[PDB]
Design a protein around this ligand. Sequence first.
Ligand SMILES: Cc1cccc(O)c1
Ligand SMILES: Cc1cccc(O)c1
Ligand SMILES: [Zn+2]
Ligand SMILES: [Zn+2]
Lengths: 21, 21, 27, 28
Amino acid sequence: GIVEQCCTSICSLYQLENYCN
Amino acid sequence: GIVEQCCTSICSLYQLENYCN
Amino acid sequence: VNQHLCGSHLVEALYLVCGERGFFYTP
Amino acid sequence: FVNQHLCGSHLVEALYLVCGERGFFYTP
Ligand SMILES: Cc1cccc(O)c1
Ligand SMILES: Cc1cccc(O)c1
Ligand SMILES: [Zn+2]
Ligand SMILES: [Zn+2]
């Protein structure tokens, strides 16, 4: 999930948008 | 919802927990 | 933009209050 | 541990900004 993906390496705003509704 | 309820008047910790999963 | 700014603080508070439960934030 | 907790705080602020009127769920 989001923590595994984006607290291990930087996520861009495009990558984070994948976790929106 | 939360904005109507807690940005017009201060919400307690107890009131905010209403919005937890 | 005050409602936007208020929502920013709301989300940080829900993060802290909800803990492992997590939360939902719908504008 | 602590760094994950702190990371999560930044994550939620970013989701708030990017998700806009859609909003989001934060499920750790
Ligand atoms: C914007 C942001 C916050 C937290 C971690 C990330 O990878 C990215
Ligand atoms: C703690 C908190 C933040 C923002 C609005 C509120 O009513 C309460
Ligand atoms: Zn502020
Ligand atoms: Zn920080």
